[PDB]
């Protein structure tokens, strides 16, 4: 298709452009180093603070219409379940609160730094750590928000057939929520050492 | 009927909002002529707002007889 035809073409320009600069003796000009040393360390940090709360909140709201849209379905013949199956809406939301906490922890570290001590060792580490801490915590919770919603619609059904099936399934949905807690940990160990900008 | 209440209540408060506005440009109130973007001459404006406020008093009395009947 068209949108799949571009992906074959972007690969081809990068390969022509990767050789023309090489067979002529200019390969060092494509230097990702200077792209990391000269770019402002504030850009890498203000993305990890917006994607953490950005990609996490997409996770929660994703798992809610997979969950709610089926609870409302079963509750046309068995409307008693709306208050017992509410739990699966809580485990979809809590990952958002995991993200909203990190963004406030990292916002404490955003300070003003001089023009001479900007591109120093302690300020490049900070930006690069606050970035891959926002991707990890925003991608883990993005997926935990989907594996809980899916698992939350099966229990919303089985509860409607016979109530004995509900509690036996939360052992799956509780092992689905661990994953959002493990990125919250690892995201901090990165930024446990990083010191605010000087 | 409803077609007159609209221009009645609108013209009613329109007289009461515009009359107070005119009194403030005249007296050169800070919030209205204190800044530079605001108009410089006060009473050159209040003379324009009395006239426009009368226009609403026309429709208040005119459609005031119509609802009466």
């Amino acid at each position: 298709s068209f949108s799949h035809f571009l992906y074959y073409l972007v690969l081809i320009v990068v390969i022509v452009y990767g050789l023309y600069k090489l067979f002529t003796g200019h390969g060092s000009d494509i230097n990702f180093g200077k792209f990391l040393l000269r770019t402002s360390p504030y850009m890498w940090a203000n993305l990890g603070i917006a994607l953490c709360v950005g990609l996490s909140v997409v996770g929660a709201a994703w798992g809610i219409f997979i969950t709610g849209s089926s609870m409302i379905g079963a509750g046309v013949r068995a409307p008693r379940i709306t208050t017992k199956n509410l739990i699966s809406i809580i485990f979809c939301e809590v990952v958002a609160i995991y993200g909203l906490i990190i963004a406030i922890v990292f916002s404490s570290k955003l300070t003003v730094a001089t023009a001479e001590n900007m591109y120093s060792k302690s300020n490049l580490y900070t930006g690069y750590s606050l970035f891959w801490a926002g991707i990890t915590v925003g991608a883990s919770n993005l997926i935990c928000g989907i594996a809980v919603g899916i698992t939350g619609a099966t229990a919303a059904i089985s509860d409607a057939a016979d109530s004995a099936l509900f509690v036996k399934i939360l052992v799956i949905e509780i092992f689905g929520s661990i994953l959002g807690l493990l990125g919250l940990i690892v995201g901090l160990l990165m930024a446990g050492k990083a010191s605010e900008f000087q | 009927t409803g077609k007159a209440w609209c221009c009645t209540v609108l013209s009613a408060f329109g007289v009461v909002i515009l009359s107070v506005i005119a009194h403030l440009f005249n007296t050169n109130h800070e919030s209205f002529v204190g800044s530079i973007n605001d108009p410089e001459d006060g009473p050159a404006v209040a003379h324009t707002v009395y006239l426009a406020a009368l226009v609403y008093l026309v429709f208040f009395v005119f459609c005031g007889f119509q609802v009466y009947l």
Binding site: Y42, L47, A50, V53, V57, S69, I72, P79, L86, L110 | -
Partner: protein, 159 residues
């Protein structure tokens, strides 16, 4: 002209202003249309449930007002000679609420359409629609929280 005030920094401010009111306006349209099909179908048979099923339209029409707010705080913080620091802070403000208010605009649309189709068949099911519709609308706000704490650090000891 100066290493701390380049001339390409206010780009990140304006783009942050637009990115907050655009994405929420898309999220508040899908959330308004996907419901508007439901109301206008269930109320072919049950027109007494009309002014009780307008609720999903309100919760989605409020997401845009969380964006208009952020489009106005940064607008008064803009200037020609502003630092690169202040730039990306106006970015992460617009990219968060624009991105959190986008998904919550979608969830409100789907759940809103199903609920109105349910209450026609089980009128006890209208309150369950609300509480399931609460936890999605709040997600349009958690990004608004972070937009502010960043923008408070805009002009703190800047030069």
């Amino acid at each position: 002209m100066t290493e701390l005030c380049p001339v390409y920094a206010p780009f990140f401010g304006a783009i942050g202003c637009a990115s907050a009111i655009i994405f929420t306006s898309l999220g508040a349209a899908y959330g308004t249309a996907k419901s508007g099909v439901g109301i206008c179908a269930t109320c072919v048979l049950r027109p007494d449930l009309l002014f009780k099923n307008i609720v999903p339209v309100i919760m989605a029409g409020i997401i845009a007002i969380y964006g208009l707010v952020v489009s106005v705080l940064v607008c008064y913080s803009l200037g020609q000679k502003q630092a690169l620091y202040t730039g990306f802070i106006q970015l992460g403000a617009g990219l968060s609420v624009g991105l959190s208010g986008l998904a919550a605009g979608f969830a409100i649309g789907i759940v809103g359409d199903a609920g109105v189709r349910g209450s026609s068949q089980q009128p006890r099911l209208f309150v369950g629609m609300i509480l399931i519709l609460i936890f999605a609308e709040v997600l349009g706000l958690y990004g608004l929280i972070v937009a502010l704490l960043l923008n408070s650090r805009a002009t703190q000891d800047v030069v």
